[PDB]
Amino acid sequence: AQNPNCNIMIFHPTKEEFNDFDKYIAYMESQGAHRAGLAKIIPPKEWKARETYDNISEILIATPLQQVASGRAGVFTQYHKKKKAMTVGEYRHLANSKKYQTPPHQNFEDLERKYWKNRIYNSPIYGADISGSLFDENTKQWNLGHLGTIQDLLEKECGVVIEGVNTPYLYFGMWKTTFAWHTEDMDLYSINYLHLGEPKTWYVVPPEHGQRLERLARELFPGSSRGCGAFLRHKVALISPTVLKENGIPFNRITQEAGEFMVTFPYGYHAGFNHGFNCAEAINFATPRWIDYGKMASQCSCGEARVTFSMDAFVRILQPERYDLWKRGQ
Ligand SMILES: NCCc1ccc(O)c(O)c1
Ligand SMILES: O=C(O)CNC(=O)C(=O)O
Ligand code: NI
Ligand SMILES: [Zn+2]
């Protein structure tokens, strides 16, 4: 069995290998990459996402989110307070201001230490889930706006025709902006390209051990766990690497830099933070191997979790027993 220790693998495809997206995902899995829950893909040197990021300042962040924490340094939740709209230009200036800028630090490890020590005492502002793309339409390889759709995958695999679209989202981050522990909707894959700016650090639990993280989360957030059978779907819980180690949860970490792709695999729990001002683009996708994970995905029905339009059809077709109860909560 490939990659039995579930290490995060890093890939360096040639420009030839970078032509067929599906084929290369399949190749990575043949080498055991999915066992980690997360992989890094470094594009061939000949490739670029777009010519420049010169005039991105006029993009609007309609609903910036202030991420307010509660709890202790290693175990906390965050809630999102809506702020007034601002342009990416205004947001970048805010990120670089004395209140919000990255502190002096020696290296990634020093900065990681500072993050887990001090995150809860600040409330950084995130521009998340902004529908759009920064890939040039003429970029033919690994263009996250030109992927095959999950709806077409389901149709090809299972012969069912369904409504729905899926499109990419932009994320503008600053120092300490945080993504909570989660898997994707319907335990899909995700792919994330860091277009510009400072790094993003990721933590990930191997899919074969996801239930260990769920069990720990129930112990660490007991009220939340009583309110919902799948509260990690709410995407508000953080647990530090120190606390994960103390409780024997298997995980790995890696830092993504500008110009690099990350792929998360079905039921790979992940969390992380941004080092400073940056812009990433991400989208969910499916492969034939996803279908079984989609059928088994645990759902939030307390009503807290957000659901796009397109998730309806996934639940309706793959989880018809759950559909009625789930739809009551959307
Ligand atoms: N009960 C279904 C599985 C499960 C358990 C705990 C969680 O936090 C979660 O998101 C999902
Ligand atoms: O970049 C972020 O803030 C979060 N991204 C993801 O969880 C992802 O790409 O799957
Ligand atoms: Ni994700
Ligand atoms: Zn819920």
Swiss-Prot record:
Species this chain originates from: Homo sapiens (Human)
Amino acids binding Fe cation: H182, E184, H270
Family indicated by similarity: Belongs to the JHDM3 histone demethylase family.
Molecular function terms from GO: chromatin DNA binding; damaged DNA binding; histone demethylase activity; histone H3K9 demethylase activity; histone H3K9me2/H3K9me3 demethylase activity; metal ion binding
Keyword Isomerase: no
Comment on bound cofactor: Binds 1 Fe(2+) ion per subunit.
Top enzyme class: oxidoreductase
Binding of Zn(2+), residues: C228, H234, C300, C302
JmjN domain: residues covered: 8-50
Included stretch of the parent chain: 11 to 340 of 523
Protein name from the UniProt record: Lysine-specific demethylase 4D
Residues the entry annotates as binding 2-oxoglutarate: Y126, N192, K200, K235
